[PDB]
Amino acid sequence: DNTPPGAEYTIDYWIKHGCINKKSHLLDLACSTGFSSRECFKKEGASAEGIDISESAVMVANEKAKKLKANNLLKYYVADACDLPFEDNTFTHVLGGCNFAFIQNRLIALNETHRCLNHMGSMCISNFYYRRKISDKLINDVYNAINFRPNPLWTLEYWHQFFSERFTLVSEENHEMESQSEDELKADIYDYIFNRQNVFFERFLKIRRPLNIQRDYQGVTLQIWRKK
Amino acid sequence: XXXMX
Ligand SMILES: [Cl-]
Known about the structure:
It is classed as transferase. The structure holds 2 protein chains of 2 kinds. Chain A is α/β, with parallel strands linked by helices. Chain A has one domain (1-228): Vaccinia Virus protein VP39 (Rossmann fold, 3-Layer(aba) Sandwich), CATH 3.40.50.150. In chain A, 42% of the residues lie in helices and 25% in strands. In chain A, β2 (47-52), α3 (55-67) and β3 (74-78) form a beta-alpha-beta unit. In chain A, α1 (8-18) crosses α2 (35-44), α5 runs antiparallel to α8 and α7 (182-195) crosses α8. Chain B is rod-shaped. Chain B is largely without helices or strands. The A-B interface holds A 5-6, 9-10, 175, 177, 220 and B 1-5.
């Protein structure tokens, strides 16, 4: 899929509250196949430079840009967020999405994005966060499931602390998530595997169960952060 | 994953 949490809704939110327009020049951070910037272009005509660690992904992003007749406005490169190949004051906006929860050195990365942003430039975020205290067992379960132990202290306050050193919170919209019933989950997994095997089903279920359970403690925050 | 309309 390669999209931010909320997909088009998130993009729309960013465009509205981030004030993205045709004059904007966006940094698509960890762009993958370039969905976010491409959507911003299609919707608003904004230009963009995207970076990702995956060469193939970048190539897909570029080809898709080409097919859209927009490769003069949308360009993608292989790079790490911790070391951006762009000059200071290059961008009016950074599309961060949920990527600060996954990139290797997120403060260094944050400082780089800060560097590359224009004066009064905006960071556009869509992060997962924990609204409730979650037991260690479930964290361990998720770690086991997908080899990526999340931090249960990644709350709103934590993110605010993280971003507020170099940025001003301009806008915030929080969406609380909730678990599916085993039946619904199984229905989705089944539907997907069989309409888009048993081994696959069992593996998928095994992996997704804890992720599903985790949702009752989580939320997604959409934020606009202004450079200060 | 998350639908928000
Ligand atoms: Cl860091």
